[PDB]
Write a structure and sequence with these properties.
This is part of a larger assembly, with chains A (245 residues) and B (59 residues). Chain A is α+β, with helices and mostly antiparallel strands and 245 residues long. Chain A is built from six helices and eleven strands. Chain A has helices spanning 21-27, 64-70, 108-116, 189-203, 206-211, 229-240, and strands spanning 3-7, 16-19, 34-38, 44-51, 59-61, 77-82, 87-96, 123-124, 129-134, 137-147, 152-161. In chain A, strands 1-5-2-4-3-6 form a six-stranded mixed barrel. Chain A is globular, with a radius of gyration of 21 Å. The two termini of chain A are 37 Å apart. By secondary structure, chain B is mostly helical. Chain B is built from one helix and no strands. Chain B is globular. In chain B, 3% of the residues are buried. Classes of the chains: A alpha+beta (245), B mainly alpha (59). Chain A binds chain B through residues 91-93, 144-145, 147, 159, 161, 164, and chain B through 27-29. Bound molecules: adenosine-5'-triphosphate. Chain A: It is found in: Microsome; Endoplasmic reticulum; Cytoplasm. Chain A: Belongs to the AAA ATPase family. Chain A: This is Cell division control protein 48.
Chain lengths: 245, 59
C-alpha cells in the first residue's frame, strides 16, 4: 500500500507529509515517524509523517517544495516506505540560493536557519532544498553535504556550515541535463526498442542469468541530424540511473 | 636528525600542512611523502628552502 495520491500541504513545513489514519494503519506508522518517499525518475527524499483525518484514503499532502524536489505535480503517485534507520546528521554544510539572498544582509544563519533548526529535527538528504521565511522575506537553502550520509536528521548536536558561495538557481538546469521521458515526443517505438535493450540488461540482469544468454551489447542509432538522438540517449541514461559517460 | 622534513622553516611554514591540505583538498564543510600531486608552495623573494624530505639514490 505504498501508492498514494498527492495533495497540497496547507502547513508550511518543507519536511512534513500527512497521511490518512487508515493509510497510517495500513502502512504501520506512528505520528511523527520519518518515511522515505520516491517520486519520478531517481529522485527521492525523507519526510516526517503526520496524521490528518481530513486526508482521504490513499492520499498524502506535500508542499510545492517537495513537489519540485520529487519532480512531481499535484495528484501524482509516489512510493512510500518506512525509514526507521535514519540517524542524526553530525555535520551538515548548506549554502543559500543566490536569487534568495537578493539584498538580504546580516548573519543569514542566525536570521533564517537557527529558528528553522531549533530542535526541528527536519530530515535532510543530499541535494535537497528547503525554504525558510525570515523577517519579511523567504530564503532557500540546499543540502550541499551531510555526515553521516546520505539521509539524516538535523539536530542540536549537528554542526551547521553556512560558509560558501551563493547557489545560483540557473545552473541547476542550464548547465545540467536532467530530462526524462516527458521531454520526448513523436518517437515511441524507437524509445521502446532502446529501452528494452538498455534498461533490461542493467535494471534486471538476473533474467539473462536465468535464461542463460548473453544480452547484446552494442547499439547503433542513426537518422537525419536534429532528430533528437542525443536527447533520446540522454533521457534513457538518466532514467536508467547508471553511471553515464 | 630532525632536518629530514621537520625542523626550522618547516614549522614556520606548514610544509606538512601544505602536503596534507593538498591531499584532503576539498570544501568538506601526519605523514609527508611524494604519493600525490604538488600544491603551490610560494615564498617571498629572498627565502630559500632546503628542507624538502630527502630521497637518496637508487642504492
Ligand atoms: N522528441 C524530440 N525529437 C527531436 N528533437 C527533439 C525532441 N524533443 C525535443 N527536441 C529538441 O530537438 C533538438 C534536438 O537536438 P539534438 O542535439 O538532440 O539533435 P541530434 O541530431 O541528435 O544531435 P547530435 O547528433 O549533434 O548529438 C533539441 O532542441 C531538442 O531539445
Amino acid at each position: 500500500d505504498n501508492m498514494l495520491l498527492v495533495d497540497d500541504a496547507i502547513n508550511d513545513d518543507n519536511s512534513v507529509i500527512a497521511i490518512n489514519s487508515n493509510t497510517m494503519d495500513k502502512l504501520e506508522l506512528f505520528r511523527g515517524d520519518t518515511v522515505l518517499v520516491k517520486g519520478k525518475k531517481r529522485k527521492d527524499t525523507v519526510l516526517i509523517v503526520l496524521i490528518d483525518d481530513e486526508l482521504e484514503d490513499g492520499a498524502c499532502r506535500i508542499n510545492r517544495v517537495v513537489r519540485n524536489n520529487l519532480r512531481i505535480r499535484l495528484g501524482d503517485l509516489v512510493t512510500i516506505h518506512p525509514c526507521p534507520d535514519i540517524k542524526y546528521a553530525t555535520r551538515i554544510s548548506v549554502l543559500p540560493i543566490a536569487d534568495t539572498i537578493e539584498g538580504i544582509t546580516g548573519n543569514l544563519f542566525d536570521v533564517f536557519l537557527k529558528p528553522y533548526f531549533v530542535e526541528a529535527y527536519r530530515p535532510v538528504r543530499k541535494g535537497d532544498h528547503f525554504v525558510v521565511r525570515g523577517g519579511m522575506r523567504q530564503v532557500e537553502f540546499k543540502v550541499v553535504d551531510v555526515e553521516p550520509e546520505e539521509y539524516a536528521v538535523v539536530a542540536q548536536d549537528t554542526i551547521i556550515h553556512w560558509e560558501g558561495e551563493p547557489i545560483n538557481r540557473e545552473d541547476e538546469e542550464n548547465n545540467m541535463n536532467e530530462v526524462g521521458y516527458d521531454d520526448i515526443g513523436g518517437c515511441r517505438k524507437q524509445m521502446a526498442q532502446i529501452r528494452e535493450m538498455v534498461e533490461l540488461p542493467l535494471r534486471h540482469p538476473q533474467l539473462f542469468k536465468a535464461i542463460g544468454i548473453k544480452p547484446p551489447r552494442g547499439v547503433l542509432m542513426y537518422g537525419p541530424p536534429g532528430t533528437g538522438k542525443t536527447l533520446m540517449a540522454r533521457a534513457v541514461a538518466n532514467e536508467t540511473g547508471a553511471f553515464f559517460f | 636528525p630532525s632536518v629530514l622534513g621537520q625542523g626550522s622553516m618547516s614549522t614556520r611554514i606548514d610544509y606538512a600542512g601544505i602536503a596534507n591540505s593538498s591531499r584532503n583538498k576539498l570544501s568538506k564543510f601526519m605523514k609527508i611523502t611524494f604519493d600525490g600531486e604538488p600544491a603551490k608552495l610560494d615564498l617571498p623573494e629572498g627565502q630559500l628552502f632546503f628542507g624538502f624530505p630527502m630521497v637518496l639514490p637508487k642504492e
